[PDB]
Amino acid sequence: VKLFRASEPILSVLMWGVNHTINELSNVPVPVMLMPDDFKAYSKIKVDNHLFNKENLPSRFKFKEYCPMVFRNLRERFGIDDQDYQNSVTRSAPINRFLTTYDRRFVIKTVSSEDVAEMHNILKKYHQFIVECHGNTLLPQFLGMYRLTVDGVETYMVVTRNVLSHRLTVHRKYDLKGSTREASDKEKAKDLPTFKDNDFLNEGQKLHVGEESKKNFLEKLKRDVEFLAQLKIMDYSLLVGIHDVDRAEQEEMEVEERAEDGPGEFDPSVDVYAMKSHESSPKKEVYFMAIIDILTVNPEQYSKRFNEFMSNILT
Amino acid sequence: KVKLFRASEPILSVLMWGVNHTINELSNVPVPVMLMPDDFKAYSKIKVDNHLFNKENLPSRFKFKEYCPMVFRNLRERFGIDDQDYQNSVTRSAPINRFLTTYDRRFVIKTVSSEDVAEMHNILKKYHQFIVECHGNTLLPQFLGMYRLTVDGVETYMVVTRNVLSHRLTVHRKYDLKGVAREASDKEKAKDLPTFKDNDFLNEGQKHVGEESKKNFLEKLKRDVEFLAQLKIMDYSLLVGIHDVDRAERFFGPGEFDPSVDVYAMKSHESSPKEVYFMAIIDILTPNPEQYSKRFNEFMSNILT
Ligand SMILES: Nc1ncnc2c1ncn2[C@@H]1O[C@H](COP(=O)(O)O)[C@@H](O)[C@H]1O
Ligand SMILES: Nc1ncnc2c1ncn2[C@@H]1O[C@H](COP(=O)(O)O)[C@@H](O)[C@H]1O
Ligand SMILES: Nc1ncnc2c1ncn2[C@@H]1O[C@H](COP(=O)(O)O)[C@@H](O)[C@H]1O
Ligand SMILES: Nc1ncnc2c1ncn2[C@@H]1O[C@H](COP(=O)(O)O)[C@@H](O)[C@H]1O
């Protein structure tokens, strides 16, 4: 019995819309293959509830889903069941627009009309490219694109798999691109600041993943970034998050002590970007690495610049 | 499990979609402690525009309006109808033959007019109150939902009632009884199941129900009609159905029925020459009326032994 409670009406409408579209989708047979129209497709629903059901939702709102057949399939290819996805978004409000779902599995970006245009151009190729790699990629996994209308205003959203873990704590993160950058004193003030290229090198940080992994990683990064230049795309980043296993085990202990008054483990079928640090690492760690920001010097250039840098991070 | 909304016309497919959509939406709405005045002036409107999506049974573009959903959900409850069953009955399979029934013959779907919907709003508060007071025990039509479909820019209003007739027992003759010169017409007398009238009944000599039933059913009919008269309504009929058992001759034997589903059904008295009767009031959305009640109420008391 879902109320769609949230801090803002926009979030209620998002919960409502993901709920409503996923249910509708489930009365729609699963196609043998996709069709070219499915990439021009969209659903539009428009609600006027007069003196009815207004405890949580506005009386009046609009929900558009772009290419709902393509993104259903995109979800299947990434191993996300539609009911799981729906539940992550509807059981309890997303919290942060840069939203996460209450359970941290899914990330919800507010985007621009441009971004949405860009999604459409690249969509045909992105699908095929997710197909021939079987979902094995460091690229953003796109699960849904939506336009919400509340109080006459329009908001564009894209849903992605969280790069970071849904359970394990991130103690330090970077945004990397590979260009001739630094996190501002304003950032450095945040609890968990987003650091950048020069911060990464300036502190000598390296990630000890182990060779069988460093290779499976750099081969992904290679297809991925060649695909991105081939599509003429630029300015993307490697998000790099670091979880210190031993420091978390202690944070836990201090969390249990307070209330009263396993470690380094993750499901690679959920924490899809996560690598254990090599037996020989100086610290017991977990990393999360994946490419972000591909909607929005040159492309052929960035590709190789970007690629050399990320290769040097690992060992 | 997968509900396609395959139906004869696309308007029926919208109906299925709409009942499905509103009933689900409602399952997320708490059941309130009481209805409020606004519940009688409320509605849901939803407008669907699907481009190159989900167009196998549904139009790409259509509109669905549901009137006073909190009232009708309460009415359903008071009539002992579960929302999920109601939903399944409309939704599992297209309705059949405007005047439809759901594929399981449990619910009728009458197409009605703008002014009918207006008359409904006009009588809803009092009709609700009366259904409350008689504890759902009434011969009146049981209003389950009222809807407005918009398909092709054309608007169609619908009311769902409970079926008077059984949803399983074949009906072998039926009458429509009011109380002037009215009887089955020439071409009407010709169809598979004719709808005879007061004079075809009287001149058919047709009359056999337990004394208890005649007593309790007449206490029912009277209480209802004094209410239909108080509301300055008239022109309503009494739909009667006759089901002969022998003529029908694992399985549900002859003359067997679930009184909780077939709510108007009544078996013959021992003394009878062996039938099942179906009786309830119909057609009450149309505004002498006080005399229409007694004229109607007595022509009826003389068809029961
Ligand atoms: N089927 C499509 N193909 C390409 N671009 C689109 C498509 N649908 C919407 N867009 C673009 O996405 C942005 C927002 O579209 P709209 O949904 O109409 O608000 C605009 O820049 C549109 O041109
Ligand atoms: N897929 C993702 N998973 C987790 N965090 C993300 C993801 N994409 C973006 N972020 C976060 O958003 C910030 C930059 O993205 P944004 O400002 O929305 O362009 C970074 O500091 C990240 O922590
Ligand atoms: N086993 C441990 N490993 C690392 N730091 C600890 C450990 N136990 C306590 N500390 C730290 O010592 C200080 C005192 O912690 P506590 O024992 O909770 O008062 C805090 O800075 C703790 O984080
Ligand atoms: N509530 C009801 N349950 C079952 N049959 C009904 C009901 N109301 C009307 N009918 C029948 O359906 C037809 C009604 O259509 P009409 O006379 O055009 O309004 C007649 O044949 C009636 O006997």
For B84-132, give the DSSP string. Answer: HHHHHHHHSS--B--EEE-TTSSEEEEEE-HHHHHHHHHHHHHHHHHHH
* Annotated binding-site residue? A209: no
Distance (Å, whole) CA B43 – CA B45? 7
Question: Within this chain, do residues B268 and B197 fall inside the same structural domain, yes or no?
Answer: yes
Whether B40 and B93 have beta carbons less than 8 Å apart is answered as no
| In contact, A195 and A173? CB cutoff 8 Å | yes
Q: Which residues pair with A46 in a beta bridge?
A: A62, B47
> Who contacts B161 (Cβ-Cβ below 8 Å, separation ≥6)?
B107, B108, B110, B141, B142, B143, B144
What is B207-275 written as a DSSP string? ----HHHHHHHHHHHHHHHHHHHHTT----EEEEEEEESGGG-----TT---TTTSTTEEEPPTT---E
Amino acid identity of residue A219, one-letter, is: E
Going B208 to B213 to B216 to B222, the CA torsion angle's sign is: negative
Q: How many Å apart are CA A217 and CA A119, to the nearest integer?
A: 25
DSSP helix/strand/coil, B175: strand
Give residue B240's identity as a one-letter amino acid code: V
The domain boundary, picked from B163, B182, B210, lies at B163
A163 annotated ligand binder: yes
Paired residues of B64 in beta bridges: B46, B149
Q: Could you give the CA distance from residue B103 to residue B85 in angstroms, rounded to a whole number? A: 13
Ligand 2 atom with the smallest distance to the CA of A109 is: 18
**Domain boundaries, position B294:** 164-304
How far apart are the CA of A160 and the centre of ligand 2, in A? 10
Please name the residues in contact with B109: beta carbons below 8 A apart, sequence gap of 6 or more. Answer: B15, B90, B95, B98, B99, B100, B101, B102, B158, B159, B160
Residue B57 and residue B18: Cα distance in Å, rounded? 13
Of A2, A27, A49, the CB nearest to B28: A2
User: How far, in whole angstroms, is CA A255 from its chain's centroid?
Assistant: 28
Beta-ladder partners of A95:
A100
Q: What is the distance between the alpha carbons of residues B236 and A203, in angstroms, rounded to a whole number?
A: 89
Candidates A116, A281, A243; CA nearest to A167 is A243
Asked whether A167 and A266 are in contact (CB, 8 A), the reply is yes
Reduced to 3 states (helix: H, G, I; strand: E, B; else coil), residue A220 is: helix
Give me B302's structure tokens: 């003389």
Question: A214 and A293: one domain?
Answer: yes
CATH number, position B300: 3.30.810.10
Active site residues of A: 109, 235
Q: Are residues A173 and A129 in the same domain?
A: no
Phi-psi region of A157 (alpha: psi -120 to 50; beta: other; left: phi over 0): beta
- Residue A132: exposed, middle, or buried by beta-carbon count in 10 A (0-12, 13-18, 19+)? exposed
Is residue B3 located within the same domain as residue B131? yes
Statement to judge: residues B93 and B207 lie in one domain: no
Interface-testing mutation among B52, B71, B87, with chain A (most A C-beta atoms within 10 A): B52
Give the distance between the most distant pair of CA atoms in chain A. 65
Q: Is A48 part of the contact surface with chain B (CB cutoff 8 Å)?
A: yes
Interface membership of A38 toward B (CB under 8 Å): yes
Q: Are residues B102 and B244 in the same domain?
A: no
> Which ligand is closest in space to the CA of residue B111?
4
Question: Which of A1, A26, A49 lies closest to B27 in CB terms?
Answer: A1
In the DSSP assignment, the letter for residue B39 is G
Residue type, A9: P
The reply to whether residue B2 touches residue A52, judged by beta carbons under 8 angstroms, is no
CA of A116 to the centre of ligand 1 (A): 6
The closest alpha carbon to B141, from B114, B123, B118, belongs to B123
Same domain, B7 and B48: yes
Sheet holding B173-177, edge to edge: B195-197, B173-177, B237-244, B275-282, B265-267
Chain A residues inside the 8 Å CB shell of B30: 1
**Terminal CA-CA length for chain A:** 50
Residue B236 and residue B292 share a domain: yes
**What is residue A105's DSSP assignment?**
S
As beta bridge partners, residue A125 has none
Measured between beta carbons, which residues in chain A are less than 8 angstroms from residue B91? none
Measured in Å, residue A287 CA sits from the centre of ligand 2 at 15
CB atoms near residue B184 (< 10 Å): 18
Closest residue CA from atom 22 of ligand 1: A117
How far is Cα B304 from Cα B218, in angstroms, rounded to an integer?
A: 9
Q: Helix (H, G, I), strand (E, B), or coil: what is residue A66?
A: strand
Q: A206 and A98 in one domain?
A: no
Rg, Å, chain B Cα set: 20
b/e A206-245 (16+ beta carbons within 10 angstroms → b)? ebbbbeebbeebeebbebbbebbbebebbebbbbbbbbbb
Helix H or strand E segment including A179: none
Report the CATH number that the domain containing residue A92 is assigned in CATH.
Answer: 3.30.800.10
Residue A122: helix, strand or coil by DSSP?
helix
Minimal CA–CA distance to A252: which of A263, A242, A265? A263
- In this structure, are residues A25 and A82 in contact, taking their beta carbons and an 8 Å threshold? yes
The response to whether residue B108 sits with its C-beta less than 6 Å from ligand 4 reads yes
Domain end residue (candidates: B143, B163, B183): B163
B59 touches chain A (CB under 8 A): no
Residue B110's DSSP bridge partners are B99, B159
- Cβ neighbours, 10 Å, residue B118: 12
Please tell me which of the candidates B4, B48, B70 has its beta carbon nearest to residue A52: B70
The residue whose CB lies within 8 Å of the most ligand 1 atoms, and thus the one to mutate among A38, A45, A113, A146, is A113
> How many structural domains are present in chain B?
2
Task: Determine whether the shortest distance from the Cβ of A261 to ligand 3 is under 6 A.
Answer: no
What resolution does the deposited structure have, in angstroms? 2.7
Cβ contacts of B159 within 8 Å, gap of 6 or more? B109, B110, B112, B116, B120, B143, B145, B146, B147, B285
Residue A257 CA, closest ligand 3 atom number: 18
Distance B105 CA to ligand 4 centre (A): 13
Which atom of ligand 3 has the smallest separation from the CA of A253? 18
Judgement on whether residues A275 and A293 belong to the same structural domain of the protein? yes
Distance CA B156, CA B145 (A): 14
- Helices B289-301 + B211-230 axis angle, to 10: 170
In angstroms, the CA A87 to CA A22 distance is 10
> What single string gives the DSSP state of each residue in A28-53?
S---SS--GGGGT-EEEEEEEEETSS
The answer to whether B3 faces chain A, any CB pair under 8 Å, is yes
B203 is in an annotated binding site: no
**A45/B52 Cβ within 8 A:** no
Which experimental technique did the depositors report for determining this structure? Answer: X-ray
- Amino acid letter, A218: L
Compare all CA atoms of chain B with the CA of A41 and give the residue at the minimum distance.
B52
Domain final residue pick, A116, A141, A162? A162
Distance CA(A237)–CA(A113), nearest Å, equals: 21
Q: Which residue owns the Cα nearest ligand 3 atom 11?
A: A250
Q: B123 and B190: one domain?
A: no
Q: Which residue has the tokens 């010097």?
A: A297
Both tokens assigned to B88: 């399944």
Q: With a 6 A CB cut-off, is A251 part of the ligand 3 pocket?
A: no
Instruction: Specify the DSSP element, H or E, that contains A251.
Output: helix A245-260
* A108 & A171 share domain: no
Compute the distance between CA of residue B171 and CA of residue B245 in angstroms, rounded to an integer.
10
Q: Do B42 and A28 touch (CB under 8 A)?
A: no
- Cα-trace Rg, chain A: 21
By CB atoms closer than 10 A (0-12, 13-18, 19+), residue A3 is: middle
**DSSP-derived pairing of the beta strands A237-244 and A274-276:** unpaired
- Of the CA atoms within 13 Å of residue A312, those in its CB half-sphere come to 13
Query: What are the DSSP E strand ranges found in chain A?
Result: 42-50, 60-66, 98-100, 106-111, 142-150, 153-161, 172-176, 194-196, 237-244, 274-276, 285-292
Atom of ligand 2 nearest to the CA of A292: 8
